[PDB]
């Protein structure tokens, strides 16, 4: 099937009509998405099949066809772009300055942008267009808004 680099929608014909369950990044022949989007199940790309290769529920990440390729990281200082791909809507770049998730194991960047659950897996970019993480795993703050972590995997 299609192995061209770029952002993709993860769809399902298991519910009413075609439903967008998430988003993913195709890079170096490897599809990268969030674990809660596919639950580790196989994906289809036209005629071809994509089989899971690596996955981890705690990191909430999964890769298809090969090991995790995305290794860029937020510099802690500059603005980033969320290439948001919302259900039924065109891909759209939203520039923002990330905040911080302070944890017992370290600090992680966070993007405070609200989008439908089907936007999970949309990439976060640096000024060079490098994927510094995926949007879609976060929390709801006391005012009801959504703040997502900048979730990045490890490249072996």
């Amino acid at each position: 099937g299609e192995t061209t680099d770029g952002v993709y929608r993860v769809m399902t014909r298991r519910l009413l009509g075609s439903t967008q369950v998430g988003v993913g990044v195709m890079q170096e022949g490897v599809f990268h998405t969030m674990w809660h989007v596919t639950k580790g199940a196989a994906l289809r790309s036209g005629e071809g099949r994509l089989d899971p290769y690596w996955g981890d529920v705690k990191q909430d990440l999964v890769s298809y066809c090969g090991p995790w390729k995305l290794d860029a990281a937020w510099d802690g200082l500059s603005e980033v772009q969320l290439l948001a791909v919302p259900p039924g809507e065109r891909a759209k770049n939203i520039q923002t300055l990330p905040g911080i998730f302070k944890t017992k194991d370290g600090d992680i960047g966070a993007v405070a942008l609200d989008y439908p659950a089907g936007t999970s897996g949309s990439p976060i970019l640096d000024k060079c267009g490098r994927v510094i993480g995926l949007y879609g795993n976060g929390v709801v703050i006391k005012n009801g808004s959504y703040v997502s972590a900048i979730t990045q995997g490890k490249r072996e």
Binding site: V7, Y8, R9, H36, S45, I94, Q95, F101
Partner: protein
């Protein structure tokens, strides 16, 4: 059964809509991969 559809190139767009605040939150991450606000 899930399938993928291309939605675009991964490129930085100069003059994109700048929005969103940058909050500093105390969070915890559990074994199920779910975040929670620590208070």
């Amino acid at each position: 059964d899930m399938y993928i559809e291309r939605a675009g190139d991964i490129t930085w767009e100069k003059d994109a809509e700048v929005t969103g605040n940058s909050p500093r939150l105390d969070v915890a991450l559990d074994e199920s991969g779910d975040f929670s606000l620590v208070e």
